[PDB]
């Protein structure tokens, strides 16, 4: 499913992401915009042979199993394909583990490149939350 911006903002708020590990909701929405374009089925291959999966582009080296990635640790204990459903729950639950691990949101490249340090509240303005 491709979420609308405000639709995803409400869904992320419903999943308790607002200020999760201190990251305001706008951070999460901005991350999803530039990671997946709000598309729950997005997949993108990386240089190290890993692939990023779903709405938050969770990586197959450390977080989920896709059977083709070197150095696989599968820390969310899930097939990567399970992070591609229309509901954001599995992605959120894995993201909560990732963002708690010590590096915060710096795990997400598109978030670092496009969202970090910016006025991320722009991403939730005008949304019914």
Q: Which of 2, 6, 75, 109 binds ligand T3Y (CB under 6 A)?
A: 6
Task: Pick the closest to residue 107 from 47, 58, 72, 46 (CA basis).
Answer: 58
Which residues ranging from 11 to 70 are in contact with ligand T3Y (CB under 6 A)? 11, 14
Does residue 83 interact with ligand T3Y by CB under 6 A?
no
Q: How far apart (Å, rounded) are the C-alpha atoms in residues 23 and 30?
A: 11
Neighbours of 95 (CB within 10 A): 30
Q: Is 101 annotated as a binding residue?
A: yes
Which residues ranging from 88 to 127 are in contact with ligand T3Y (CB under 6 A)? 88, 126-127
Angle at 71 (CA atoms; ends 68, 76), nearest 5 degrees: 85
Query: In this structure, what token pair is assigned to residue 16?
Result: 């308790």
Q: Which residues sit opposite 65 in a β-bridge? A: 79
Which residue, 77 or 86, has its beta carbon nearer to ligand T3Y? 86
Q: Which of 87, 97, 103, 106 binds ligand T3Y (CB under 6 A)?
A: 87
Q: Which residues bind ligand T3Y (CB under 6 A)?
A: 1, 6, 11, 14, 86-88, 126-128
């Amino acid at each position: 499913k491709v979420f609308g911006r405000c639709e995803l903002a409400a869904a992320m708020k419903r999943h308790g992401l607002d200020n999760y590990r201190g990251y305001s909701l706008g951070n999460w929405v901005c991350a999803a915009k530039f990671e997946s374009n709000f598309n729950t089925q997005a997949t993108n291959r990386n240089t190290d042979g890993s692939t990023d999966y779903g709405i938050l582009q969770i990586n197959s080296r450390w977080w989920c199993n896709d059977g083709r990635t070197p150095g696989s640790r599968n820390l969310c204990n899930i097939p990567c394909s399970a992070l591609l459903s229309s509901d954001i729950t599995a992605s959120v639950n894995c993201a909560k583990k990732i963002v708690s691990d010590g590096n915060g949101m710096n795990a997400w490249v598109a978030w670092r490149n496009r969202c970090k340090g910016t006025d991320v509240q722009a991403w939730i303005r005008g949304c019914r939350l």
